[PDB]
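Posted in: Protein Modeling Q&A

I'm a second-year student putting together a small comparison for a lab meeting, and my supervisor asked me to include a predicted structure for Alpha/beta hydrolase family protein. I've never done this before, so apologies if this is the wrong subforum. The sequence is pasted below exactly as I got it from our records. If anyone can share the structure token output, I'd also love a short note on what stands out.
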Amino acid sequence: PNPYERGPDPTEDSIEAIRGPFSVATERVSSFASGFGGGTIYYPRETDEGTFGAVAVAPGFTASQGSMSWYGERVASHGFIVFTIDTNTRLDAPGQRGRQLLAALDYLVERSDRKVRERLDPNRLAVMGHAMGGGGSLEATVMRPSLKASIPLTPWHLDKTWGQVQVPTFIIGAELDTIAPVSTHAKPFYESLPSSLPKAYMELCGATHFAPNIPNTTIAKYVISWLKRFVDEDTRYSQFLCPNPTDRAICEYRSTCPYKLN
Ligand SMILES: [Ca+2]
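Accepted answer (user: helix_wrangler)
Welcome! Here is the predicted structure, written out as tokens:
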């Protein structure tokens, strides 16, 4: 059996739930941590099912973990360690945000508290980021191809060619995004990704550049499903991902389905 499967068999209602099956505790990380600006670690409390993978969450330009705080309890309650981080300076570029995403992951593995390290599987790490943090999410996978999953949220980046990414990448675009429009950012990012890569592009209807900053069930249900399928190798969640989701909130979806288990 898959030793990384956590939680009961998933329903369409379960992935959408505000509170997952797990109970969430937290740990505050000082900004004097090396490589990044600290953050808040959300981790499951139940330990009788085994350790969990982790996901580091980066904010956008001039932003902090407050704009990404709702991902913590929402995602960690489904069986993940969520590390919403702050950057060194709020004006950090996408390239710098990719390094600090990895520096946060290193902290989880090397210097985190015993209560977090004892619950952590350091071989199953993922990244996620909003806007310039989304560009940093793409940057991190280029810097560390061993990551399990990557979720750029309405990402922004100068470079458009990502044809050497080897990490399963889920790009969420906003239809009415005029800061990082999907026509010149999110879609060119997805298309430049290797055709052989397990990837997906979800465009939210009527959403703006700042939609990932507020509780959104369409984002949460498939962020959870993407993390389950590639961080936990939980094929029980391939149902919600392949074939392409048909939610009313979604305006366009592209994928390399099916995601054959490797
Ligand atoms: Ca620091």
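A couple of things worth pointing out for your meeting: Residues 1-262 form one domain. Residues 31-33, 36-37 surround calcium ion (CB under 6 Å).
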